[PDB]
Enzyme design. Structure first.
Site, PDB file in Angstrom:
ATOM      1  N   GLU A 267      -0.823 -62.816  -6.326  1.00  0.00           N
ATOM      2  CA  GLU A 267      -1.602 -63.495  -7.247  1.00  0.00           C
ATOM      3  C   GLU A 267      -3.273 -63.420  -6.973  1.00  0.00           C
ATOM      4  O   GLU A 267      -3.488 -63.177  -7.928  1.00  0.00           O
ATOM      5  CB  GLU A 267      -1.368 -65.042  -6.893  1.00  0.00           C
ATOM      6  CG  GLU A 267      -0.109 -65.556  -7.473  1.00  0.00           C
ATOM      7  CD  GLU A 267       0.025 -65.443  -8.811  1.00  0.00           C
ATOM      8  OE1 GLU A 267      -0.942 -65.034  -9.653  1.00  0.00           O
ATOM      9  OE2 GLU A 267       1.300 -65.727  -9.423  1.00  0.00           O
TER      10      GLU A 267
ATOM     11  N   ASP B 167      -7.179 -69.572 -14.023  1.00  0.00           N
ATOM     12  CA  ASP B 167      -6.222 -69.635 -12.627  1.00  0.00           C
ATOM     13  C   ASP B 167      -7.319 -69.382 -11.832  1.00  0.00           C
ATOM     14  O   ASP B 167      -8.226 -68.531 -11.454  1.00  0.00           O
ATOM     15  CB  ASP B 167      -5.327 -68.164 -12.561  1.00  0.00           C
ATOM     16  CG  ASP B 167      -4.467 -68.198 -13.745  1.00  0.00           C
ATOM     17  OD1 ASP B 167      -3.946 -69.339 -14.151  1.00  0.00           O
ATOM     18  OD2 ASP B 167      -4.238 -66.881 -14.394  1.00  0.00           O
TER      19      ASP B 167
END
Length: 130
Positions: A35, A53
């Site tokens: 990620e 995000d």
């Protein structure tokens, strides 16, 4: 901050992530790796839907944290997205625990399915002493 592998492993272990809701430490390490690359200040805006995000776990501003500019945002973790950008990952971990308390669990992150699910993820914690 950009964490070194084993440093992160030990930190997560200390924060009670190992085996949290059935999720082993090695899976969490695989998640953070793909990620953000163990980078706490990593942010990623999605122009197609207006949500961003944030942090090491790339937690979404639509459901989990509040940045004030995401439409129909629920702040499930009850945190400012700013908190998920600190070097101290205690808030990011508490929010990540919240996320997996939902039925999907760790599957909530697509990257986990692409690069961690059904794979040999041992490599992420080898030699770290956790």
């Amino acid at each position: 901050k950009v964490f070194e592998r084993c440093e992160l492993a030990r930190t997560l272990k200390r924060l009670g992530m190992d085996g949290y809701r059935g999720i082993s430490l090695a899976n969490w390490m695989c998640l953070a790796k793909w990620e953000s690359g163990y980078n706490t200040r990593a942010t990623n805006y999605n122009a197609g839907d207006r949500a961003t995000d944030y942090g090491i776990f790339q937690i979404n501003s639509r459901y989990w944290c509040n940045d004030g500019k995401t439409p129909g945002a629920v702040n499930a973790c009850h945190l400012s997205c700013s908190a998920l950008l600190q070097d101290n990952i205690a808030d990011a971990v508490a929010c990540a625990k919240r996320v997996v308390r939902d039925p999907q669990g760790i599957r909530a992150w697509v990257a986990w399915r692409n690069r961690c699910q059904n794979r040999d993820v041992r490599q992420y914690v080898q030699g770290c002493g956790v």
